[PDB]
Amino acid sequence: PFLSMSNLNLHNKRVMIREDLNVPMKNGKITNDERIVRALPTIQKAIEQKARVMILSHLGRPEEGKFEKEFSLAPVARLLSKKPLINDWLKGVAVEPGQAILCENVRFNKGENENNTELAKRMAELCDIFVMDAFATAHRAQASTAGVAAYAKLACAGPLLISEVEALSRALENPQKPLVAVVGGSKVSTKIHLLENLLDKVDQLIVGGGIANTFLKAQGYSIGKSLCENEWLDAAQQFWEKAAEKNVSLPLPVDVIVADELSEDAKATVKNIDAVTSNESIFDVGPNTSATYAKLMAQAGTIVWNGPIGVFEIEAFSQGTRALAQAVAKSTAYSIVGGGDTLAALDKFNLTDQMSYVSTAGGAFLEFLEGKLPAIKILTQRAK
């Protein structure tokens, strides 16, 4: 699709690597460095080929033009060396072959967020080659993610954006069939565009949570005070029909666990969808349902899963989402998961390293599966 850092010669060149070093911080110190640990090899391969390395990154959300130490990449710069912070980097920097410097937070610059042309051209001035190695940022057009690549002598993607693209697109443009997609969450309305793209691709599709509750109500079931989006019932109904004529299996919950208050404390009751009374709510799938899911995972050649299928955070309402998680683990399909809350689940059940690929990207992960990304567009345009 586009050019890669592996296929380009970096000997003695000025190389500008955009990374996601946007780490959490507490009163001046780093609390989680997984992003640095992930970004390291890209920086090691550049140095090993004796590039003159300029490391580019964002941190928090500062006021453009207003320097504050709170959003300084200083602690990162110390933590990188252990594995200099350059401040006035736009006017130029000498960098010897084989060493690496970290430019100060790119979001300080007047014009980053608008993808200002002038700013971008100036960034492109400062380097021979630009390496977009920041998939978690690729879904927005900003001078440091999009503009710079538009006007840089030579532009390409780094190996991380490569791993992430390989995994996502592996399971979306020639999946080992059957492909199954599990999609859960609070709202149809935040995941409808994802459902649309996957519909043209999957063999089975499974909705969970709010989403499933909306679909069950579009079908005419009663679900009491369960979370649902009434305003998307027509959308859900029409999507159900589209699935039917494409022959995409779309099994809804046949049994659920309900309670009349959401807490570790109240009566959890396993029920047929028939039997949901007027002031109960659905918080999880039942055994019959999560056995149907368990079958499709076991038979799957590929799996894509975004969103827990019950209120897994409370313990009575977690059996459904664990069951599912375990099925994807034991399963032999190439599994791909993503989402803030889904990772949280995979962490709670300590099943994270059993999925073939875990995305930590959040929004860019989601927009890609929707079939929509500015960073990627330009990297190919330049490969051409």
Ligand X SMILES: Nc1ncnc2c1ncn2[C@@H]1O[C@H](COP(=O)(O)OP(=O)(O)O)[C@@H](O)[C@H]1O
178, 300 contact by CB (below 8 A): yes
Q: Which stretch binds Mg ion (CB under 5 A): 48-56, 197-205, 268-276, 320-328?
A: 320-328
Is 339 annotated for ligand binding? Answer: yes
**Options 282, 296, 373, 375; binder of ligand X; rule CB under 6 A:** 282
Q: Which does 313 bind (CB under 5 to 8 A by kind): ligand X, Mg ion, none?
A: ligand X
Q: Which does 306 bind (CB under 5 to 8 A by kind): ligand X, Mg ion, none?
A: ligand X
Q: Measured at CB, which residue is nearest to ligand X?
A: 185
At closest approach, how far in Å is the CB of 313 from ligand X? 5
- String marking each residue 224-263 x if it binds ligand X according to CB under 6 A: ---x------------------------------------
Q: How far apart are CA 349 and CA 345, in angstroms?
A: 6
Q: For this structure, is 363 an active site residue?
A: yes
Q: Which of 170, 187, 322, 348 is catalytic?
A: 187
Check binding of 312 to Mg ion (CB under 5 A): yes
Q: Which of 363, 372, 377, 382 is catalytic?
A: 363
**Options 62, 147, 253, 320; binder of Mg ion; rule CB under 5 A:** 320
Q: What contacts 26, CB < 8 A, 6 or more positions away?
A: none
Q: Tell me whether residue 320 or residue 339 sits nearer to Mg ion (CB atom).
A: 320
Q: Which does 119 bind (CB under 5 to 8 A by kind): Mg ion, ligand X, none?
A: none
Q: How far apart are CA 76 and CA 33, in angstroms?
A: 9
58, 144 contact by CB (below 8 A): yes
Q: What contacts 133, CB < 8 A, 6 or more positions away?
A: 5, 17, 18, 19, 39, 42, 157, 158, 159, 160, 161
Return the number of other C-beta atoms located less than 10 Å from residue 6's C-beta.
12
- Longest CA–CA separation in the chain, Å: 72
Is 38 annotated for ligand binding? Answer: no
Check binding of 255 to Mg ion (CB under 5 A): no
Q: Which helix (H) or strand (E) holds 208?
A: strand 204-209
Q: Nearest CA to 321 among 254, 364, 264, 257? A: 257
> Interface residues for ligand X in 193-222 (CB under 6 A)?
209-210, 213
Check binding of 306 to ligand X (CB under 6 A): yes
Number of residues in contact with ligand X under rule CB under 6 A? 19
Q: Nearest CA to 232 among 190, 184, 185? A: 190
Strand positions, DSSP E, 119-178: 129-132, 154-157
Is 140 annotated for ligand binding? Answer: yes
**Options 62, 320, 339, 374; binder of ligand X; rule CB under 6 A:** 339
Check binding of 186 to ligand X (CB under 6 A): yes
User: Would you name the residues annotated as active-site residues?
Assistant: 35, 187, 340, 363
